Amino acid sequence: RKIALITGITGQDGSYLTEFLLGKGYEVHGLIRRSSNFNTQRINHIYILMKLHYADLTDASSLRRWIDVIKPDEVYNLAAQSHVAVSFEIPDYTADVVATGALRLLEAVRSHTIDSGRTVKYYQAGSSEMFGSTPPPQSETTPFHPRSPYAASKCAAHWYTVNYREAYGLFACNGILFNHESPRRGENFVTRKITRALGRIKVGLQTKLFASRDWGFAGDYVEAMWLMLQQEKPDDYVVATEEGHTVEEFLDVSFGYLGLNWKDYVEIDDNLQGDASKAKEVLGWKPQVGFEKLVKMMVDEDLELAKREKVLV
Amino acid sequence: RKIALITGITGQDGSYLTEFLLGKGYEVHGLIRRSSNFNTQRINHIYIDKALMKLHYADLTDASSLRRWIDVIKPDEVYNLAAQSHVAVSFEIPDYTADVVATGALRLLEAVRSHTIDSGRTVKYYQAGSSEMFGSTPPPQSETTPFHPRSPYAASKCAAHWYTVNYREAYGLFACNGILFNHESPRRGENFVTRKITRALGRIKVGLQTKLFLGNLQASRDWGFAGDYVEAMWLMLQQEKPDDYVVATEEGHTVEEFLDVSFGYLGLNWKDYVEIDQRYFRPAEVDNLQGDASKAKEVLGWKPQVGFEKLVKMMVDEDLELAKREKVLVDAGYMD
Amino acid sequence: RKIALITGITGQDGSYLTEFLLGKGYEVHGLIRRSSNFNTQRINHIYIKALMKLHYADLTDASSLRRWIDVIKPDEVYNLAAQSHVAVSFEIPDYTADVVATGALRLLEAVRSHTIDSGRTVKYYQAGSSEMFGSTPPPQSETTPFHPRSPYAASKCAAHWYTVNYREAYGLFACNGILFNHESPRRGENFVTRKITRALGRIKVGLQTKLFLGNLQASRDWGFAGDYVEAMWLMLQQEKPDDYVVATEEGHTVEEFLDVSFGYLGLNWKDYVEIDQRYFRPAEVDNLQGDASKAKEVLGWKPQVGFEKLVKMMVDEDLELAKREKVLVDAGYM
Amino acid sequence: RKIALITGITGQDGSYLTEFLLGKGYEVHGLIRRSSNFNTQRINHIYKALMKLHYADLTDASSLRRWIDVIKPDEVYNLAAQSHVAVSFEIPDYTADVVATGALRLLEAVRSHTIDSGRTVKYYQAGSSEMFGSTPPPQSETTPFHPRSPYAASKCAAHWYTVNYREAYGLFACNGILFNHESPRRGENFVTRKITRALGRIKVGLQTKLFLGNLQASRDWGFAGDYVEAMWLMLQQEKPDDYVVATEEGHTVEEFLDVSFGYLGLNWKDYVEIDQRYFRPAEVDNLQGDASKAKEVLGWKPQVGFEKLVKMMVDEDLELAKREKVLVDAGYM
Ligand SMILES: NC(=O)C1=CN([C@@H]2O[C@H](COP(=O)(O)OP(=O)(O)OC[C@H]3O[C@@H](n4cnc5c(N)ncnc54)[C@H](OP(=O)(O)O)[C@@H]3O)[C@@H](O)[C@H]2O)C=CC1
Ligand SMILES: NC(=O)C1=CN([C@@H]2O[C@H](COP(=O)(O)OP(=O)(O)OC[C@H]3O[C@@H](n4cnc5c(N)ncnc54)[C@H](OP(=O)(O)O)[C@@H]3O)[C@@H](O)[C@H]2O)C=CC1
Ligand SMILES: NC(=O)C1=CN([C@@H]2O[C@H](COP(=O)(O)OP(=O)(O)OC[C@H]3O[C@@H](n4cnc5c(N)ncnc54)[C@H](OP(=O)(O)O)[C@@H]3O)[C@@H](O)[C@H]2O)C=CC1
Ligand SMILES: NC(=O)C1=CN([C@@H]2O[C@H](COP(=O)(O)OP(=O)(O)OC[C@H]3O[C@@H](n4cnc5c(N)ncnc54)[C@H](OP(=O)(O)O)[C@@H]3O)[C@@H](O)[C@H]2O)C=CC1
Ligand SMILES: C[C@H]1O[C@H](OP(=O)(O)OP(=O)(O)OC[C@H]2O[C@@H](n3cnc4c(=O)[nH]c(N)nc43)[C@H](O)[C@@H]2O)[C@@H](O)[C@@H](O)[C@@H]1O
Ligand SMILES: C[C@H]1O[C@H](OP(=O)(O)OP(=O)(O)OC[C@H]2O[C@@H](n3cnc4c(=O)[nH]c(N)nc43)[C@H](O)[C@@H]2O)[C@@H](O)[C@@H](O)[C@@H]1O
Ligand SMILES: C[C@H]1O[C@H](OP(=O)(O)OP(=O)(O)OC[C@H]2O[C@@H](n3cnc4c(=O)[nH]c(N)nc43)[C@H](O)[C@@H]2O)[C@@H](O)[C@@H](O)[C@@H]1O
């Protein structure tokens, strides 16, 4: 039975990757941060073959400890302070987690394989944010011009990973993923912010609702992560839908799906075009969920959520 | 108007202290951690009532984030409540715990000192001390009772205690150490024994749960009400001179007695649901904690208003309502 | 009187830059690490009243950085501090990244926090390295893409971007000096050039017999640290902040270095050199040669010391150093 | 062949412990920090294949565990630290991360090692009398701690992390609560070496003034060469414990001045001037240990007494000063 270790398992991607690997018969171990409040909202339904362990990317000891006890076959580093805006607020912390944290995991894995003679496949959660202002089309080889501490930190993590591959021959893959959403997307993100409101509005619990992007479904993307680690050789891959859409187009589809006009609730207050050819060719990966289905999917779940709220009220 | 800066505002004590200070007319500022999930459940109702309560992103392991907000806020009082506060968890992540509970407290102290000197302002500081620092030292424990920490968390609290005392003695910083004993409430973290019990009890009463797993039932603790204790933190900073005070009810009870009172209050025999699992036992345990709050009573005039029985019943009532709320969702087919 | 704060002042570049700035009438402050041993060998002479002040701090300690920035209120900041050895970076990657990458960010953030809190204005220099280009083919210029081959290199790439991000995001006057290999008689003895000349001078006096090296094929663009520190200062004297490659636009291999140095003393390096695998890096950087057209045209900077002169300048020093040692050893002083 | 891993091997104690263990037939490994300058001045004369140096840092957990796995040491001596008390007030955060958390990282790396490999390791923590702070003497193992500096509070923390790993996991970890100990290898920024180093230069005419701070502070001074032996002894017992290592004799900085200068026929009052900058924000007034337990259980006792220690340091620094004068009048420096 293959064993997988996931950092950032409580996040959006972690929650889906967990379900995916389980369906694959994998034994899944995830590292979680201690917090004063419930923090396993995305994987609660799963917990009730999945083990959770306390750890932190800023604590190298905690990382090596669990890798030694778990002896994973595949390690997915999805953990990070993933909010771009917030990264300007806590740059040091973000760098320590996103950049150095990644290096700690890499070094913990390399050290482990040398001490135990074992083999480990590694995945680094890269981001299209690394490209920054570089003009399209952005592929695996496009140069980075990060525009935030978060992006710069991901660039560093990307390079530490590549370095461990070329220097030690570690099976380390960099998934350069573009924006992906889902019903579990953090509410601090535009797509989820919108669908959350709509559900509330429809239920009548809410009154008002406060650069284009390549949005894909988180469920599809984690599959590409797994595919990367199943190839013969380690490599870096861009994962995107290669299509664009606007927040308004999102509003129309979202609100239109529930028979509401967005102009009755809307309250007015970069340029990434990825080439995922390599992913399609080498991994045979293809998004099986389009923009429309993704939106209506988010809307349905957020409505079910609003109703749960109306019932309580 | 008085400006207060609270670290660990999202926690149990932080939520109560916030309500208490706002009640005193304070302008409250709190530092929070970015999380992939909702993390302001305890203070949401206050924030939604940006004005008198602002929240800022920071981390006790990031010294820059601390100094930055101290400079921006120019607080009059600083309450360091932030911490990886679970004892059992500290054995699993000692390094992270130490960096936050020990060095983290030092980072704040040093950020406050640098601020007051660079800007000439004055700040009163409060450090969230714990009875856990006494460790195995026999009760009753007072301000003069020696420490003998039994976990990485406790040893880190002692360090934070000494860093604080040092900044007071070395720089004249008005810094106080609140040596608080266990204090609970309906907002207590669910992974702590008292909350874990009343939460499970409430579910059992409504048929949503049937078995409750616990560890050492013979451990004895001095349990007060967090609502009462946050007042003591405030009092400490109002005195003429800084000092350290033990805050407790001076009444001790075992976990088993907590079970008797809680379950018995709802007409059930906990022995019918409770089961023991070695996984909840800790490498090094703290057997008996009971404080002597004579100094707080005499100097701060502080006295706990909520007693043990009332606290237990308060938590049971709240968690029962919670369980019923969940029961309604299951009944309506909204919850699985 | 301008005030400059130099991190990594005890290092090679730090010592030269300090002299250069003092010669310009600057008040120089340096941040130094506490150590159980003497660690100011390169700057101790700068004393022989106090235009050079040293303060205890560390790039892994954000508070220590902001602390001296507030007290010093500098006009210019030069971040030269770093775990600068590439081979060592493969051994202690975590620490290296924390000093070279996050450490640079801590300084940047401390400077920005300082300017916003005091309304003051500060100019900032980041010590970038040609090592960032890694395996990318030469000649490498400011537009050449990076492909780091070591944790150190990757970390310098991070610092580069953090620096660029602060300039673009907050309008901070921050420049990236993309300096290529630069040696001097003060160069660390664990780097190839100094290792060679030091061993040479000693071999020449009978103090040493065998010199162990790694990859002699490695080609590099070697300049003189004394010349390069001037470019750092010029960069900050411009109207607008930018990034510049500082090099000699001439590459030579380590063997060529070995030919010139030993031959200069009429010796045949092949008679004393041996190859040890331990000195090979897990991932190597083959050829580095810069394109400093931008520095010349904009800063008006040009390297005064050529390769030959550099090698002979280093050999002369270490030879005289080896001779003095021999005298002290012969006299029973060492 | 016994294997020892020493953190802080380049420091005073590390250099003596290395010699002591090598003389005991040990294979010694030491962790050193990468630096821009030569940093092995104290152990160069040793480094002919039983002493290995590896790059690491107490603020880098990975680096620690890494070498512990490769080396698989039987005994670990944690002497690594930002050991200057005055400096600790200026860089409290770093000092804490190294002295307190750094000690915890090593303990956790050793525990993780022994659990993952099944091997056994004996651990020594370099505790200090500074932990007692202002608590009045005599100070023994159980005397309450009242740290007066970030350094001391960090040592107090390291002390408890160490005791906790012993009580919680049964790890063989001992806390050596050592009082001040000097030697000709002592750091020049410490009062004793500062004084003897200056005295020597004054005697040969290379220096004229010596600036100091509080001369009334009282300390229990022993010889590092003697103390490192107590460290080894603690780990040779059947059970782990904590022991105070001291001379039990206290003296003031002034007495140190009378003895050292008087030894060369000089009056220190003619060269010493008080500088307010050398005073610590919070001072440690009087330290005198009770090393009964060490003598009774370890059979350990100091060989070098106060005056002998002072004269030892003065002799070396005088000869060093004379040798400098010669190199000065020659153009070598
Ligand atoms: N989603 C996207 O569109 C894009 C995301 N990515 C990246 O892919 C990864 C997954 O994204 P996503 O699921 O949306 O992110 P989320 O923000 O939903 O989840 C982040 C996860 O990281 C954990 N984490 C944060 N800090 C630490 C720490 N110090 N130690 C350990 N764990 C920590 C979080 O824990 P906790 O719950 O406690 O906060 C959470 O589990 C991230 O690295 C993200 O940057 C890449 C491209 C785009
Ligand atoms: N409660 C008790 O009975 C006793 C507790 N204490 C101490 O008093 C304080 C308050 O207790 P309590 O409210 O119950 O504790 P909680 O665990 O409920 O709250 C801890 C708080 O600290 C925050 N925090 C944790 N790590 C960090 C970090 N690295 N940076 C910033 N913030 C962080 C938490 O944030 P987040 O929500 O994201 O996790 C939360 O706000 C704590 O220090 C605790 O150890 C002392 C004696 C008694
Ligand atoms: N010289 C070259 O050929 C090239 C160098 N560079 C870079 O330019 C800078 C200067 O180079 P160079 O003078 O030769 O390097 P050195 O290695 O000689 O000097 C490094 C300096 O950084 C200090 N330092 C290291 N770690 C820390 C820390 N954690 N906190 C504070 N200070 C620290 C060192 O202190 P300590 O003495 O205590 O060790 C020393 O002062 C470095 O960043 C280097 O990487 C760029 C291109 C080429
Ligand atoms: N000496 C005394 O009188 C007393 C001292 N002690 C303690 O005993 C120990 C030995 O003392 P002593 O020899 O005099 O101290 P020194 O200051 O001479 O030596 C300290 C050692 O620790 C190393 N070190 C410092 N920081 C780090 C770090 N971050 N990572 C790795 N290594 C590091 C130093 O390296 P580097 O050379 O690079 O600086 C040096 O090898 C110390 O822990 C000290 O605090 C306790 C009681 C008494
Ligand atoms: C004062 C102190 O109170 C709390 O620290 P404590 O360790 O005293 O609180 P906790 O409620 O966790 O445990 C109290 C005692 O009950 C035992 N116990 C029995 N079964 C269980 C169980 O299943 N879970 C937990 N968590 N504890 C259990 C414990 O072993 C212990 O003996 C925290 O809030 C600290 O942060 C704070 O400093
Ligand atoms: C520009 C770059 O220069 C320096 O980094 P570098 O790695 O370019 O310089 P170094 O002198 O270490 O090596 C140059 C080339 O020669 C090879 N070499 C062969 N044998 C040896 C040997 O024994 N020791 C060393 N140190 N190098 C050896 C190296 O492998 C490499 O190919 C540092 O100052 C960096 O901080 C800076 O960023
Ligand atoms: C035991 C303890 O000893 C040492 O810590 P200490 O602080 O005891 O050593 P130090 O020699 O620095 O000071 C001893 C006492 O003399 C006073 N003193 C007077 N003038 C001066 C002066 O100019 N410099 C210094 N450094 N000290 C001066 C000090 O204030 C103090 O009262 C370190 O080795 C620690 O790491 C170790 O833990």
CSV table of C-alpha atoms in Angstrom, one decimal, chain A residues 21 34 51 54 63 72 77 79 113-114 150 166 170 205 211 229 231 245 285:
chain,number,residue,atom,x,y,z
A,21,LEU,CA,-5.3,9.4,-3.2
A,34,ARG,CA,-2.4,23.5,15.9
A,51,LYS,CA,-3.8,10.1,9.7
A,54,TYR,CA,0.9,18.1,14.2
A,63,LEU,CA,9.0,17.7,9.5
A,72,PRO,CA,6.2,8.0,2.8
A,77,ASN,CA,4.2,20.1,-0.2
A,79,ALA,CA,1.5,24.0,2.7
A,113,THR,CA,16.4,8.7,2.0
A,114,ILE,CA,20.1,8.8,2.7
A,150,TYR,CA,4.6,35.4,-1.8
A,166,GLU,CA,19.7,18.3,-10.5
A,170,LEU,CA,15.8,13.5,-6.1
A,205,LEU,CA,-29.8,36.4,4.8
A,211,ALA,CA,-7.0,41.7,-14.3
A,229,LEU,CA,4.8,11.8,-9.7
A,231,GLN,CA,6.1,9.5,-14.8
A,245,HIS,CA,-13.0,34.6,-18.0
A,285,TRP,CA,-3.9,15.6,-18.3
